[PDB]
C-alpha cells in the first residue's frame, strides 16, 4: 500500500526554431507509511506519462526511515542549497505541525508528531531534499551506543 501524492506540477518549456516545446514536470512522493519513502521528479509531454515516470523513479529510489515513539528522535536541520528545514521532536498528540512538501514527506514516511519549520527557500524540490537530508542524517540511540561503547542507551 505505497500511497502517493502529487506535490508540484510545473509547466516547463524550451524554445525551438519557431514555437515552444511545453512539458509538464511532476514531483511525486511515494511512501508506505511504515518507514519507506522516496521522491521522484519527471517530465513528459502529458500529465499521465509524467506521473507514471515520476512514480517509477520514486519507487526506484526508496530510503529507510526509523521512528522513535512515532516521532523524530533528536532535533535536526536539513540543508540543501538555500533551503534549510528544521525538524524538532514532539510529544504524542500534537500531530503533524508541517505544511506543504515537508508535510507530504512526513505523512508518507509515517511520522505522527513532528515540529517543522522551513527557514529558507520555498521551492518544493529543494525543501524535499532538505527534509530527506535531515531525516537521513538522524542517529539512532543504538548506533551511538555501539560507537561510544555505552550500554544500549543506558545512562
Amino acid at each position: 500500500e505505497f500511497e502517493e501524492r502529487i506535490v508540484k506540477l510545473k509547466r516547463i518549456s524550451k524554445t525551438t526554431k519557431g514555437g515552444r516545446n511545453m512539458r509538464f514536470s511532476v514531483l511525486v512522493v511515494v511512501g508506505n507509511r511504515k518507514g519507506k519513502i522516496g521522491y521522484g521528479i519527471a517530465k513528459a509531454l502529458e500529465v499521465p506519462n509524467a506521473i507514471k515516470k515520476a512514480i517509477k523513479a520514486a519507487h526506484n529510489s526508496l530510503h529507510t526511515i526509523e521512528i522513535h515513539k512515532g516521532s523524530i528522535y533528536h532535533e535536526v536541520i536539513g540543508r540543501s542549497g538555500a533551503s534549510r528545514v528544521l525538524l524538532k521532536p514532539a510529544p504524542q498528540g500534537t500531530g503533524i505541525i508541517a505544511g506543504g512538501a515537508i508535510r507530504a514527506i512526513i505523512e508518507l514516511a509515517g511520522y505522527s508528531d513532528i515540529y517543522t519549520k522551513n527557514l529558507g527557500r520555498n521551492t518544493p524540490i529543494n525543501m524535499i531534499h532538505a527534509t530527506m537530508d535531515g531525516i537521513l542524517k538522524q542517529l539512532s540511540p543504538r548506533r551511538v551506543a555501539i560507537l561510544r561503547n555505552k550500554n544500549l542507551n543506558e545512562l
Binding site: 528522535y73 533528536h74 532535533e75 521532536p89 542517529l139 540511540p141 551511538v144 560507537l147 561510544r148 561503547n149 555505552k150 545512562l155
Partner: protein, 141 residues
C-alpha cells in the same frame, strides 16, 4: 617520544582543540598534537571517559619547560569516527553562563555538553545529578 615539526596552538583553548578534532575527523586523520593546557587536559580526560577518543597522552620537554598533548581519535573498523560534530558555546568575548535550571540537553541526550562548574569540567548528566551548573564550554555529539 620524539617529534620533528614545530607545534603551535591558538590562543583560545577550547576552540583550538575543537578545530583540531573537527579537521582530523573530516580528513580521516587519526593522531594529532597540540600545546598542553590544564583546561585542555581535563576536557580531554572527560572526552576519553565518555568514549569519544581512543587515548590522550601528555608529554614534557627534557627541561620541563614545555608540555604538549597528543591524542588519537576512535575510528571503527570501516573507518568512520564516533564524533559527528563539535560546536563551541563560551567563545572569547561572549562568555555563556547558565544556572542548573537552564543546563542544556544536547541532541536529546545522545551527545554530551562540557560544563566547567566548580570541580573542573563536568558532563551534563553528572552536572544535573550534582544540581549545580556553570560555564558551558562546548557541545560535542
Amino acid at each position: 617520544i620524539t617529534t620533528t615539526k614545530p607545534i603551535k596552538a591558538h590562543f583560545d583553548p577550547v576552540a583550538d582543540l575543537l578545530t583540531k578534532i573537527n579537521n582530523a575527523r573530516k580528513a580521516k586523520l587519526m593522531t594529532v598534537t597540540t600545546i598542553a593546557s590544564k583546561l585542555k587536559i581535563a576536557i580531554l580526560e572527560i572526552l576519553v571517559k565518555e568514549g569519544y577518543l581512543a587515548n590522550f597522552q601528555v608529554l614534557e620537554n627534557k627541561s620541563k619547560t614545555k608540555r604538549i598533548v597528543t591524542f588519537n581519535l576512535k575510528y571503527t573498523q570501516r573507518r568512520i569516527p564516533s564524533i559527528n560534530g563539535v560546536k563551541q558555546i563560551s567563545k572569547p568575548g561572549l562568555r555563556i553562563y547558565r544556572p542548573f535550571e537552564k543546563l542544556p540537553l544536547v541532541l536529546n541526550g545522545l551527545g554530551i555538553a562540557i560544563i566547567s562548574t566548580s570541580d573542573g569540567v563536568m558532563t551534563d548528566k553528572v552536572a544535573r545529578l550534582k544540581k549545580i551548573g556553570g560555564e558551558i564550554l562546548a557541545y560535542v555529539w
